[PDB]
Design a protein around this ligand. Structure first.
Ligand SMILES: [K+]
Length: 324
DNA sequence: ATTACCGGGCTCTGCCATCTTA
DNA sequence: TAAGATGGCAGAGCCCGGTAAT
């Protein structure tokens, strides 16, 4: 009865809430008051509170005791209340989609038990919160799958493969095993690719590749291949290029292309580009802004050493001065 | 005094489908 | 027997600078 009124004064988007979790609105008891007070208690602005509820209405079904206990467990990993407010604003669902604090506590035990440091649990919680709402078994699955995948390739102690990858790729424990398998076999196939090459690739520069959704990797590589072929680069060169800079698989196809095109419209050859893959770190805006500045001076770009295009502001700005 | 090499810092939700659970 | 709990999916970059090399 009193439910819609409170939410309305709270700033909530009621129509949106009802669409996401209609069920919640057919309960006779809801604790929307205690939650407001609870988050207010921990420093959340009223606008955040509304935003959290607008996106995860079920949040209002939790009791002060539960909320307080879950919060204190997060504070076993994160150090300030503010850190947690921020995470919840960014992703409500991770905190509120479960109310099994025992399970949560077991995740924390398990993850410690795998040999991860607190800075590593902190990193996980901060950037991949939803890790801690996983079932214990689900986190166990992924960990067992990595160990198995560690030894299924030539790794000396899998225990440490797990730590390296989980540190380099914080988002791995919120991916399905299905998905991460398919991304590994995608790399193994498309490129050489013997166990050791593969292993560094996964731990180092191609670590983010394991998070790509189904076939989005395959599809984004296809585009790379076409667009580079079209410009006169051979498959070898395409492979060499992408392996020396796998980040390029994460770009939206359209971005890659526009990026390639903005560079080349200025008479920078496809050759300069793939022998200096990092120029592609820069957003298109930055590239575009820098291109303007240099051609504005006496630079011809056709023959310049274009590495500066992806230098830091400092080093770039310094060098631009010197050119004029 | 200048650039290359390379790794690190940031960084991941919001939706739907299929169970459990009471 | 309807909600709650849980799993899984699509979508996706940019920047900085230490230190080696010259
Ligand atoms: K109920």
């Amino acid at each position: 009865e009193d439910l819609l009124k409170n939410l309305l004064t709270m700033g909530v988007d009621i129509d949106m809430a009802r669409k996401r979790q209609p069920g919640v609105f057919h309960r006779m008891i809801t604790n929307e008051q205690d939650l407001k007070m609870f988050l207010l208690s921990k420093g959340a602005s009223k606008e955040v509170i509304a935003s959290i509820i607008s996106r995860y209405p079920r949040a209002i079904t939790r009791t002060p005791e539960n909320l307080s206990k879950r919060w204190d467990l997060w504070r076993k990993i994160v150090t300030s209340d503010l850190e947690i407010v921020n995470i919840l604003e960014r992703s409500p669902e991770s905190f509120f989609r479960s109310n099994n604090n025992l399970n949560l506590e077991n995740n924390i035990k398990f993850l410690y038990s795998v040999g991860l440091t607190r800075k590593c649990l902190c990193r996980l919680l901060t950037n991949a919160p939803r890790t801690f709402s996983n079932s214990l078994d689900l986190n166990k699955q992924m960990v067992e799958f990595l160990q198995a995948a560690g030894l299924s390739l030539g790794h000396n102690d899998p225990a440490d493969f797990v730590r390296k990858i989980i540190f380099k790729n914080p988002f791995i424990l919120i991916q399905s095993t299905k998905r991460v398998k398919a991304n590994i076999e995608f790399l193994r196939s498309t490129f050489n690719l013997n166990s050791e090459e593969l292993l560094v690739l996964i731990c180092g520069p191609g670590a983010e590749i394991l998070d790509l959704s189904n076939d989005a990797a395959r599809r984004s590589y296809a585009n790379i291949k076409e667009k580079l072929f079209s410009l006169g680069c051979t498959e070898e060169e395409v492979q060499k290029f992408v392996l020396s800079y796998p980040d390029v698989i994460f770009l939206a196809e359209k971005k890659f292309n526009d990026k390639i095109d903005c560079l080349m419209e200025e008479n920078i050859s496809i050759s300069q580009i793939i022998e200096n893959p990092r120029v592609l770190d820069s957003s298109i805006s930055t590239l575009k802004s820098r291109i303007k500045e240099l051609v504005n001076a006496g630079c011809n770009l056709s023959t310049l050493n274009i590495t500066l295009l992806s230098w830091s502001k400092k080093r770039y700005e310094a060098k631009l001065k010197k050119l004029s």
